[PDB]
Amino acid sequence: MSYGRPPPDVEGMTSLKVDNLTYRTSPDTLRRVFEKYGRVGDVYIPRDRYTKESRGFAFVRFHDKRDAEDAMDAMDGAVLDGRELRVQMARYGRPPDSHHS
RNA sequence: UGGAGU
């Protein structure tokens, strides 16, 4: 079982974004950790789709404004080693293509 | 480096 192609509603929701995954974090943790604030519409990683050498972040996505600004006002900048969280609103949309030619 | 999904 996998995401495949989860259809969001980004055209009518807050579409929050989160990043700054530590050298020991994963999207499954980023989900259980940000799900407690309310809900998450997606939690996914570009992982260069075939090289995964980046993984320095995991683009999580929210829909509730009140739960998106709260998770941001309650976890971003809560760092203690040089990088723990970075969360703010998205202003950029899904890729049409970045992995083929 | 703010997303490369069948």
User: In this structure, how many other beta carbons lie within 10 angstroms of the beta carbon of residue A72?
Assistant: 21
Dist. CA A63–CA A89, nearest whole Å: 10
Question: What does strand B contact on the protein, if contact means CB under 7 A?
Answer: A 2-6, 10, 15, 17, 19-20, 42, 44, 46-50, 54, 56-57, 59, 61, 86, 88-95, 98-99
The domains of chain A are located at: 1-101
Query: How was this entry determined?
Result: NMR
**Is domain A1-101 annotated with CATH 3.40.50.10440?**
no
CA A2 to chain centre: 17
Which residues in A8-28 are b (16+ Cβ under 10 Å) and which e? eeeeeebbbbbbbbeeebebe
Q: What residues contact residue A88 under an 8 Å CB cut-off, 6+ apart?
A: A16, A17, A72, A76
Dist. CA A74–CA A51, nearest whole Å: 33
The token duo for A51 is 């090289």
Distances (CA, A) of A77 to A49, A52, A92: 28, 25, 22
